[PDB]
Amino acid sequence: STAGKVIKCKAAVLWEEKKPFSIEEVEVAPPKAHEVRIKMVATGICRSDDHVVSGTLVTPLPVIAGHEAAGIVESIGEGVTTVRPGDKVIPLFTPQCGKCRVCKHPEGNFCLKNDLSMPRGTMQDGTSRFTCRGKPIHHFLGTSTFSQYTVVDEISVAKIDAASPLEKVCLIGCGFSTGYGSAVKVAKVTQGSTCAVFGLGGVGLSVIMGCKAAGAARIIGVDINKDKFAKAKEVGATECVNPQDYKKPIQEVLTEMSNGGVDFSFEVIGRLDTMVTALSCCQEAYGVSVIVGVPPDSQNLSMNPMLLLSGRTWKGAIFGGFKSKDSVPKLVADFMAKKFALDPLITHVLPFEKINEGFDLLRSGESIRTILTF
């Protein structure tokens, strides 16, 4: 009943940094060629969405944020072949165009069509599908999931199992897949190894899940909020440490605990200092450190390259290294077959209209993932 028509719906518009979202009516244009309009069902609150608010992650404003979500296709533009109206789908904040050198590479996943490296806040064609108060509103990472309806490019959507529970599998659109893949795919954690995970939010917990799935013998969680430790242990941490409890720097503590450094470390916070600490705490000759956290915009870290010369490997990744469109449906299928759990990540559920309360919960330290329902 809405195909080819502008849809008026509610969205959470961010007009200004460091302000609450405004829940108000937007106009959502119909999809153009190779675009898909999605009726959103559930969306998670990821710290990266908060980074938009805080100016940690710079993207043009005003904006409809949201990137961790699931919904049902309302209509498809001309030439769309990979989804149909009524399909369950997860928007892909990292696209998979299938054609660029990265998409063709066996390891690569950071498709050249992404809007993360140099955000413009548009569709692939450089325009916006959103109007609010008569004004154009930017997209975010090609997804913009904080809206009852969004429009995405076909390369930024994956069809998923028709029987999928969308209020759970929305987490596969960012935080679960990111953390889990960072462990299993990017670091390639080995059986019997010792891992250190810095930051015990939704993504860090998913890292722990992956380290445990990979057979790590020890998984040391690191967080300044000791309230995060119980859940970390539930999902596989063998020990947790709070840097504030120690006189010495935590890289020294972790090196001591691991009898000379850990096999694999993960920065899952977004601080320059913890990126360097996480590198330092891995064993100097054969350790591997993976950066997952998003750093403050345009800031450089300082480090001694002797940390690498001895033999350490330092890498980072977006979305756990997963080729997004290939991997998301498989991850959903695996979830359905109980190969991993998502409930440990979900601490709060709210209606979409309570988005600002959801962000308050994240900022206070109380939540892991709040799932918003439309």
Next chain:
Amino acid sequence: STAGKVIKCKAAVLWEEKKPFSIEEVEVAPPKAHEVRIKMVATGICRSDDHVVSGTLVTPLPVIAGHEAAGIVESIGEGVTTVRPGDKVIPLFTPQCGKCRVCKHPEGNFCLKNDLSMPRGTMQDGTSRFTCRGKPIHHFLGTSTFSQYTVVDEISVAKIDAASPLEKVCLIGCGFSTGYGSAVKVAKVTQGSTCAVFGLGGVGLSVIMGCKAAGAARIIGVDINKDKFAKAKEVGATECVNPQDYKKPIQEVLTEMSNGGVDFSFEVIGRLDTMVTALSCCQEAYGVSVIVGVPPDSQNLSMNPMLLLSGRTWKGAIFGGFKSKDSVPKLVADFMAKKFALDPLITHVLPFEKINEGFDLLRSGESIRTILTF
């Protein structure tokens, strides 16, 4: 006969930084338990030896430097089982104790017994075998090859083929193995790939050798000294570029040349700026950059961690990642079987007594490797 006796011999002593070596008589104690005394036959001049002179690499002075060498065992201490008097040997500046966690790890080579991380300038037992003018003289990296005789720990020497030409295979003690391994073992260069090699000295040429052996399609040499380009092409470079020729930063040039970044880059100079440039010029999603150059003491680089978050891998290594005592004899065997060439690295051969002239050749840009003969 000399076994069990102090040897008085000629050595090149470095009394203080930024001075010529002093060629004079030293006393070399006999080997203690698990030590080996070696009559030197040939030693190369590696830029790392010059770093000791320039204060780029801090190690206790006064010192007998030299670490890239080959000789013949004169005598063995009690308990030595791996070499005998008369054997051809290469001192190992990275030891292989076989017992530490690094030695037991499949990918580690930076044995915990090394004297590089926190240099003490002694034998494993904390003492020196060298005196000169009544004063104790420090060792360098457990090798000290700028002497007619040295004493090394058993874990810092490998037996090699009795038919080996020592005036060539001394380069397997540092520069060749480092560069070749950095390509084939540390980076794991792939067939058909594009590589960039920063620095076209003995080590960088050996990196090129390895990239070509691994089947790279393109190997771009980068040096500010265009006189290095002809030999780089001889050993496999497909193109060479001098950053001084361009208005733009060379990472931008290399990214353009490689249609979006190289597969593998190598820093083989020892500058903070070129370490960051080399990282930046590899493809952002799947590129790998290896630091080989030795940085100036205690200096930190500055970099934006988004370079890693997109998917790059950054690593470094000592001695090409090779487990030293296992690998050196095999590399010599491979050389004797014509699997690689060493002559392209050798531009000058001088008597040991001309050590200062050999260093002047390096510093002036005129040599690759000078081999000093005893």
